[PDB]
Amino acid sequence: LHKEPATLIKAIDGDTVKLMYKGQPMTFRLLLVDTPEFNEKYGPEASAFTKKMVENAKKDEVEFDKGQRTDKYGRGLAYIYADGKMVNEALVRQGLAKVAYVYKGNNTHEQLLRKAEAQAKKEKLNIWS
Ligand SMILES: Cc1cn([C@H]2C[C@H](OP(=O)(O)O)[C@@H](COP(=O)(O)O)O2)c(=O)[nH]c1=O
Ligand SMILES: [Ca+2]
């Protein structure tokens, strides 16, 4: 896989963010994770965590997997990096997202994320508390 440039347009919630990619606005849905909705427990904390990462970064990047690049709603499907740190993994490691929506052929980072989740669960963080 490879990282590509993007710029933040606006944070939306824990697992969606609006970026400019190849000069066009797009909503991205983060691969392999599920944050709580804003109205649910940990939802506001997941939104705030993603927003801080993507806003404070000097450089945001998108990395598509090998399969589908957009979902049925027209959202981009990608791993998002903020100054080289993967948002998807960081949410899981903090217990602010579960590993979820693991479809075959866009699952390159599945085991990296499952290791983060085991660590968050052992530490009883957030969703796992
Ligand atoms: C993360 C991801 C979600 N989706 C779809 C499945 C779910 O469909 P349904 O809307 O029918 O439930 C929805 C979950 O997104 P949200 O968690 O953003 O609601 O997005 C994919 O198709 N591919 C993906 O990789
Ligand atoms: Ca969600």
Side-chain angles (χ1 to χ4, degrees):
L1 305 190
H2 73 289
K3 292 171 190 61
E4 297 181 58
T7 59
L8 181 64
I9 293 174
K10 70 165 141 75
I12 304 170
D13 78 349
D15 61 20
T16 62
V17 61
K18 192 168 168 182
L19 305 172
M20 190 85 97
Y21 171 67
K22 287 181 175 183
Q24 303 303 330
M26 292 181 57
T27 296
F28 283 86
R29 176 63 167 83
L30 271 57
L31 283 171
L32 302 187
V33 303
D34 191 38
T35 51
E37 301 299 325
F38 183 81
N39 77 309
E40 293 168 345
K41 209 182 174 159
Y42 304 106
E45 290 74 15
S47 295
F49 184 96
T50 292
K51 174 186 159 70
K52 172 173 202 189
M53 283 191 79
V54 296
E55 279 186 352
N56 289 10
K58 293 312 146 155
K59 166 159 92 173
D60 295 320
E61 295 173 284
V62 167
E63 177 183 67
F64 293 106
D65 211 320
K66 296 284 188 141
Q68 291 84 335
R69 293 188 178 197
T70 53
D71 71 10
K72 65 190 184 186
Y73 303 120
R75 300 179 300 179
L77 295 173
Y79 309 102
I80 300 306
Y81 294 82
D83 289 334
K85 191 172 168 43
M86 201 204 300
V87 181
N88 315 49
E89 186 191 12
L91 286 157
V92 175
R93 180 66 184 85
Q94 286 310 309
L96 292 171
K98 293 188 189 185
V99 178
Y101 294 106
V102 183
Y103 299 95
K104 83 180 282 181
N106 275 335
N107 69 344
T108 295
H109 298 314
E110 176 181 11
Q111 292 304 133
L112 177 79
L113 270 52
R114 296 202 181 274
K115 179 59 172 292
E117 190 177 266
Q119 291 165 310
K121 196 181 297 195
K122 198 125 336 147
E123 294 170 10
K124 298 291 174 66
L125 300 184
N126 292 315
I127 289 170
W128 307 116
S129 76

